[PDB]
Automatic annotation (TrEMBL), chains A, B:
Keywords: Signal. It holds the Pfam family PBP_like_2. The keyword Signal applies. It comes from Vibrio parahaemolyticus serotype O3:K6 (strain RIMD 2210633). This is PBP domain-containing protein.
């Protein structure tokens, strides 16, 4: 029984779904096909009834989507909340930059110390996305890819007095033992609320509402949440 | 250093916050003082600026609270979705009851077989809250308080052909192996999306927005979510 999900290219490449889908299929017998595109296109496919539900991280676009009746039962999956931490003295002087892309470029061009998780985690993928957007390849001397989790990455950044990008949660749990501060967090790219929204079965009595609602229900119940969190750690 | 949180009686009595506040305090140093009441009063406390943030599970009332500017930065914290399942034959005849409270009262009165998690998890606490509202202590002999997880509880209900309360997510995972059906759902008490909402500093310039936002941020980040999920599983 087949469930078609439209989502973003970001999301597809993040690896999130590779973490969820196997368990969901094992649990329910549903097979999810992922079609990844830009946000407007993902939502358009939902508006056009090409897919059974959508997963995006664009609150304004999703608000209109629901308001016009294209989607129903919107649900928040997770709030991705990232911050840039570094030495209190901020030797790259990123503290007052405007965008996180300016922050990355500045760190690279000053060859400041930067610790990457380098472990293909969701956090690691997100860091790599920003480098890709800056058009810089993270090759500078200061750049260190340790191959470790968020906590050890923070410990490394404190030891070497370098910068890193952390989820706020790990930062808060560790700050008491880190010689670092939050130095930058003013960028909408750093905060991403995710929603999963069902295609309105009133608009499309033909779509697989039963399968789509099962996936959504599973995603927000503790079983799905355990896996989502596991991926975010 | 004191953050004041208004929440509902059921949330208070569930003990959810005892699993959270010590870790939040450990991480951030903030102390949260909790006041509990009915939904209307909980939100009224936010409206009056008596507390710094609110945590309720009443989407419509919360929408109004946000729309009027009483609260800002609303975030969905967790989705509760519970069903009452039992044998197709529904021998206790709860299928057509009106209220989940009626269902509970009817099961106790007929001394029907009912399987409780009995393990002080969130589901169990939710169940116990229902008993409390019916003013019944479940001591009838058909009541089994085993101390196991959701899957084993469902399996036992299926083997015994009795009733139990299940989150929908585990139900979706196990339903193919169980000789049970959903017999009662669609009572408002069974579906509760929680929201945390900050009291608006534009209304109350001296509100502890900093502490309240720290608690909110913490709740939606992976570390806080893992605590919440550990309680819910």
């Amino acid at each position: 029984e087949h469930v078609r999900l439209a989502t973003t290219t970001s999301t597809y490449h993040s690896g999130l779904l590779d973490y969820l889908l196997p368990q969901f299929e094992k649990d329910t017998g549903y097979k999810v096909d992922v079609i990844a595109a830009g946000t407007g296109k993902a939502l358009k496919m939902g508006e056009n009834g090409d897919v059974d539900l959508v997963m995006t991280h664009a609150p304004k676009a999703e608000g209109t989507f629901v308001e016009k009746g294209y989607g129903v039962l919107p649900r928040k999956l997770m709030y991705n909340d990232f911050v840039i931490v570094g030495p209190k003295a901020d030797p790259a002087k990123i503290k007052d930059d405007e965008s996180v892309l300016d922050v990355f470029k500045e760190i690279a061009n000053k060859n400041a110390t930067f610790i990457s998780r380098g472990d293909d985690s969701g956090t690691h993928k997100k860091e790599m996305g920003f480098w890709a957007q800056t058009k810089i390849e993270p090759n500078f001397g200061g750049y260190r890819s340790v191959g470790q989790g968020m906590g050890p990455t923070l410990n490394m950044a404190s030891e070497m007095q370098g910068y890193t990008m952390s989820d706020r949660g790990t930062w808060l749990a560790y700050q008491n033992k880190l010689d670092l501060e939050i130095l930058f967090q003013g960028d909408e790219k750093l905060f991403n609320p995710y929603q999963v929204i069902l295609v309105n079965p009133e608009r499309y009595p033909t779509i697989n509402y039963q399968g789509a609602k099962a996936f959504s229900d599973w995603l927000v119940n503790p079983r799905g949440q355990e896996l989502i969190n596991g991926f975010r750690l």
